[PDB]
Structure 1
């Protein structure tokens, strides 16, 4: 995720002529400006502007600690910031930024090599760290991209299999001719000159050596000149672009609680039935003998009582959460519940609480995954200082991804609220209580008005859920109740934009509250939109208390 991908004046990987072109068409007015990618430095941009009808191009280097600055200028926490600052203070520039050269309608930034490099490295960090695949992997990427990128830049080259901490030119030469003499086979070693390294590669059965040089900035360099923040990136980039090399890198000559928790560090990120064998025998109805129901309760709600337990599986014992439906069948509606549970037993997403199965004994029991973190709204109460706006944006994201999935499968969650989003940890939220057939504050009108439950109705309560989240647990439509809102709503009257909730996110939960359920968007759009916002927030520096902040 590029931090400057939301800014409508950012054009991605384009040349100078292209930039200068767009700038013509827009007037040439003094203070007109755009931002684009820098082709020869990883993470950098180029600030281009028009002063006295002449173009000015300012390279913006991405420093090591994450800050961005024009050479010899002030450092910023990011592009957005950088461009707001120079809008009200030229500070060295010819004039102050004035009119963004907003991108024309329908265009989006043009993907560059670094983008592919970034998205690719990400995909492989996860793939290898958590041996994840299928949507499982697609889903851990979408939500955790931002965090991975940060882990990537902190991953020491010493750790990599292609780095050899104490080889000399000849030793290097020696080793390489020792194994398979394929083209592209390579290693990297530390030079005498501190902060210098060598890239030894095999081509046409000959070892070639390239010097890697570091900056006063601390960046890393191919004598070709392209600049990277770490060796791993450099190396990973040279398997793609052969610039300045006899040949590109291929195979690697081989070598010999956490601060910030991730969603896939958990046991519940992936379905219990993903062990092929465990999957083979996936009964909707569970035996009561393989169930251990604790006497003490996790909580209690309108629907029933929730008790922690543990379930015996073919090869493992899993922590489960049991909900005891307060209400049983009455009439052979029993199956109809069965019919449903059958549909829920299918839904598989890392961001929803999964149905392990059901079990009937003393009571009808809903056996589900263990998200013992307690619900969203409570978790956020009075934690405005402790839990940054980005970390909330991240949990709202995960919820969107769950509803996205649920939408996909033509499944309506009807009881969507903060109270129905349960944290596994501070960065991992799961949606729950989806098929359970004042709590009418979340319901879009047409549910109340016509009992019409669509995913478009869910889209409403999401906007409601967003409000609760972005205002740290505060009740919604406090000052009201029942028809009080029904009327309050009928008249284009909406909830307020909680303090310090960005414009985009409000404008979002707002579109969620468009009376005509048709004119309202679908989750596909929401998660899409929710993503950009989240991403721009996360790519920055991190707020809050704890120990994950020291990292």
Structure 2
């Protein structure tokens, strides 16, 4: 049962992983008066959101970044402990927005938030961790997922990568290649390693018995990413995501080449 529910589900005006378009429409079929607004999952930043509000009949979209310490914020805005709090705050204070929030655009009756890719990642990595940590399976597994998600999350989005099997504390491009070539040389075999530059690492995987290297950089915010641009709290999250989508890679990550 991949794909997990977002922490902002209970909110009536939360649409989940939709597009600006669908969101711009929902607001179009809701009046279009100053203040109307809704909340959706951010299509780029895992754990992120986007505040879509209308003012002067014009549409406004403010991305909400999920900071490493768990708070949420519009770029240059104040931090909040959650999206509800963020919406409650702006409802009573524009603090820079075109106007305060007045009247939400509750998702039409019968409709509910839709699962983006990030929702698959969360279930997938929580699912993997448990099944691999306690060998749970079947219904037993499905429960520990709901019960451990909160912990697994705190764990997977926090654990030092120095402890992950696929992380090799010290290896040069050449050192790396030799290790990947010396094995089952199967598509997807991969490992991670540090780069000279500060906050830069290198993903090295094999495909077609040939080795490829990808640069992973850490931005001011403290999140990692490869050229394609999807950003993450941790390498673990990033690795587990690259196992789902080749986002720029020649091939998706599969088996880890042992520490």
Asked whether the two chains share a fold, i.e. TM above 0.5, the reply is yes
Q: How far, CA to CA, are the matches of 2:6 and 2:150 in structure 1?
A: 9
Q: Deviations over 1:345-396 (max 9, x none)?
A: xxxxxxxxxxxxxxxxxxxxxxxxxxxxxxxxxxxxxxxxxxxxxxxxxxxx
Conservation of the 8 A alpha-carbon contact between 2:6 and 2:16 = no
Aligned partner of residue 142 in structure 1, secondary structure: helix
Q: How far, CA to CA, are the matches of 1:94 and 1:168 in structure 2?
A: 51
- In our comparison, the structure showing a higher alpha carbon Rg is 1
Conservation of the 8 A alpha-carbon contact between 2:35 and 2:53 = yes
Aligned partner of residue 227 in structure 1, secondary structure: coil
Q: How far, CA to CA, are the matches of 1:145 and 1:136 in structure 2?
A: 14
Conservation of the 8 A alpha-carbon contact between 2:218 and 2:224 = yes
Q: How far, CA to CA, are the matches of 1:219 and 1:204 in structure 2?
A: 30
Q: Quick one: which of 153, 160, 163 aligns to 2:164?
A: 160
Aligned partner of residue 40 in structure 2, secondary structure: strand
Aligned partner of residue 250 in structure 1, secondary structure: coil
Conservation of the 8 A alpha-carbon contact between 2:126 and 2:148 = no
Q: Deviations over 1:222-251 (max 9, x none)?
A: 210001110011111111111211111111
Q: Deviations over 1:45-94 (max 9, x none)?
A: 01111010000110111000101100011001110111100000000101
Alpha-carbon distance, 1:145 to partner: 2.3
Alpha-carbon distance, 1:143 to partner: 2.8
Aligned partner of residue 99 in structure 1, secondary structure: coil
Q: How far, CA to CA, are the matches of 1:47 and 1:238 in structure 2?
A: 27
Alpha-carbon distance, 1:155 to partner: 2.1
- 2:210 maps to which residue? 206
Alpha-carbon distance, 1:147 to partner: 2.4
Conservation of the 8 A alpha-carbon contact between 2:72 and 2:83 = yes
Conservation of the 8 A alpha-carbon contact between 2:193 and 2:203 = yes
The TM-score with structure 1 as length reference comes to 0.45
Q: How does 1:56-205 map to 2 (within 5 A)?
A: 56-205=60-209
Q: Deviations over 1:202-240 (max 9, x none)?
A: 122221111001011100112100011100111111111
Structure 2 unaligned blocks of 5 or more: none
Q: Deviations over 1:27-53 (max 9, x none)?
A: 111001011111111101011110100
Alpha-carbon distance, 1:174 to partner: 1.5
Alpha-carbon distance, 1:134 to partner: 3.0
Aligned partner of residue 157 in structure 2, secondary structure: helix
Aligned partner of residue 146 in structure 1, secondary structure: helix
Q: Deviations over 1:505-548 (max 9, x none)?
A: xxxxxxxxxxxxxxxxxxxxxxxxxxxxxxxxxxxxxxxxxxxx
Conservation of the 8 A alpha-carbon contact between 2:170 and 2:193 = yes
Alpha-carbon distance, 1:149 to partner: 1.4
Q: How far, CA to CA, are the matches of 1:45 and 1:139 in structure 2?
A: 27
Larger RCO: Structure 1 or Structure 2 (Cα < 8 Å, ≥ 6 residues apart)?
2
Q: How far, CA to CA, are the matches of 1:66 and 1:200 in structure 2?
A: 30
Alpha-carbon distance, 1:137 to partner: 2.1
Q: How does 1:276-355 map to 2 (within 5 A)?
A: none
Structure 1 ranges of 4+ moved more than 6 A: none
Q: Deviations over 1:123-151 (max 9, x none)?
A: 12222222222332222222332222112
Report the RMSD for the aligned CA atoms in angstroms: 1.1
Considering fraction of residues, name the structure with more helix.
1
Aligned partner of residue 144 in structure 2, secondary structure: helix
Alpha-carbon distance, 1:190 to partner: 0.6
The TM-score with structure 2 as length reference comes to 0.95
